[PDB]
């Protein structure tokens, strides 16, 4: 009886919805120029599955209970479709194969689709259900597939130091330090209490588009200036601005955005392993009264400190505890999420299958439950000064179109420029037509 | 003071040539008074003299600690061990040149051929688990993001602590296997990781730089490119000439004088740090000629700190250059020579930014 995690529990449930809703998957398309050893690629795929038990794990059960069934490397190797194609039809094939649903009760949670273009050029697609792989796992997937292919293409079994921890250890660790849910003044009990007090089509498609969002360095500097003034980060500055925009658009005095945090970077054992380690954090901000941007920046800063002090309760478990009527067409607790990243090395640049010219093939935006996902890059000069804020407003297609998203992106850029040049502006006197 | 790294392309810049005319050892007050060693005999003296000074990083260590670590690692580069490693390196070279040919022209020789080859040889020499090599490169590379560099350092140190434990129990081949065999708990996991990281990083950077720029150097002397294919026994001489001409390790760290010495008539006071320009000492007497016998250069340093990996480097460069010239007779650059971009003078090794090649 191997337990699943709170995130796996939610992912399994949402996986039983059907073709109309795009599968909640992570996926990577790799252009491979050169002579590909197809039988070595198949062996390397099985080797990645052998290395990560979760990739050969199955999820049988029902509405009341789901179980983690770990298969061996052979029975439970990922399927490998070989689908000869022309560049012509690669966009449609990649989208279709990435969206094909998983039957997690009788299938391993990942698969591969090879698309031969010539004898020296192919495109490989790897899809993994988010019950088994998060965003960071895609990088781990490709790197471990490259390591296994280099050995397999030389007629050799991959020679690697095995995983110290498997995801089964993480599922039990979650079942453990969480079992004190019903106990006065317990660790997680304190956290469950913290979030309680702190807080459309009937069938979604989960299709996401994106529009660009650029802020010049001038307005970027003034936000960084105001952020430092209140002991906050650039995330806090954009969080406050976005909270004002949504407050006026929806006419609500209490806006709650979220943010996706990656795996716990402290737990170093999780670094090389595949898993649904995505942690989500609600950031409810009260705009009661009529606060100014500086004052909203403070409320944003304060909730981020308390929330990060309370991130051991999984978001999916908290959802079960504070959502009365959950919806498969509206994300729980928050529908808008914000990512603010410092510039860093791109993992796609360092993906290389030995013997093949490797380069990433772009895919459409990932399937999401959110209505809006603002992902921004916090560009800096070598001194740490503002050097532009560049990113994308990822929008839900069941909820906006490109024009409605462009109008939203432009509306937020205006708000960002306004509160930067006048941080004392109240919530009411802000320019949102 | 930046003149020591100004180059035409592979050749000495005019400003550096004018400086070397001013004798092989110049004093230069800035702020303090520095010294430039620009002559072969002068650089040998300032490196071979006991009157100068500068975990697992042998280059920043000094006696007696430098002796303690150099003693444990040096026998890994023995003549017999390098000879035993040749057929493996030869197969690695052949494989990467097979990938180069099958992928077809053009090819970005540096990141697609030279880099992978140098790192694959370095990992077979170290005894690293042969398919954790990509991961150890990625965890120890200098790609920015200081938090990421610290997190990668934590993850790599954890891997090395597990590998050192596995090796100290039942070791195997490679430099790490021998150091764990001949020495147990005499060397820590930190020093073991430092030695290993220096090999697969800065040492790989120099090897890949020699492979790339050396290929360009042979390409720009086509008659010697063909001569090396015609007379492959010239490989050892060609490598000595290539490393002398390239001098990818242009300048050395300052050898601060512990005493007041007089290399020539000019007195060097205690504290006047003297900077060694291997590029000047190797290129100020000169043309490229792989037929030269008994090459006279300091491309691998001198003194107690002379390059520990020169046996492997020479070995790997010879196999690569001779295999390359015979496998790709029509090899040429895919771009005009002007479009060949070189690293800007940054004092830390000299290299191409990329080498577009076709055939
Ligand atoms: C597999 C290849 C190589 C390995 C493993 C290697 C390793 C090392 C090590 C461990 C040291 C420090 C020794 C000590 O301080 O006692 C060193 C120094 C040095 N290496 Fe290498 N090396 C390699 C290739 C090269 C190449 C291609 C060059 C080309 C110029 C080079 C140039 C030097 C120089 C000049 C020094 C002395 C630096 C100084 O004294 O300031 N090495 N090497």
Author numbering:
A (entry chain B): 1040 to 1238, 1257 to 1490
B (entry chain A): 6 to 35, 39 to 62, 77 to 307, 311 to 384
Would you copy out the relevant sentences from the publication that reported this structure?
In order to gain further insight into the nature and sites of the Oxy/X-domain interactions from kistamicin biosynthesis, we were able to obtain crystals of a complex of the OxyAkis protein and X-domain from kistamicin biosynthesis that diffracted to a resolution of 2.6 Å. OxyAkis shows the archetypal P450 fold, which is largely composed of α-helices aside from one region of β-sheets. The active site heme iron is coordinated by the thiolate of the conserved, proximal Cys332 residue, whilst the I-helix that runs across the top of the heme contains the Glu/Gln pair of residues (Glu228, Gln229) that are required in P450 enzymes to maintain an effective protonation cascade during oxygen activation. The closest structural homologue to OxyAkis was identified as the related GPA cyclisation enzyme OxyAtei (RMSD 1.5 Å), which includes the same orientations of the capping F- and G-helices above the active site. The Xkis domain within the OxyAkis complex adopts the typical C-domain fold composed of a pseudo-dimer of chloramphenicol acetyl transferase-like domains. The Xkis domain shows the same mutated active site residues as seen in the Xtei structure, which includes the mutation of crucial histidine and glycine residues (HHxxxDG to HRxxxDE) that render the X-domain inactive for condensation or epimerisation activity as well as blocking the access channel to the active site itself. In terms of the interaction between the two proteins, the Xkis-domain remains closely associated to the PxDD motif at the start of the OxyAkis F-helix, but now the X-domain has rotated in towards the C-terminus of OxyAkis, increasing the number of favourable protein-protein contacts around the OxyAkis D/E helices and connecting loop. Burial of a substantial surface area is observed in both complexes, consistent with the positive binding entropy, with the OxyAkis/Xkis complex displaying a slightly larger buried surface area than the OxyBtei/Xtei complex (976 Å2 vs 725 Å2, respectively).
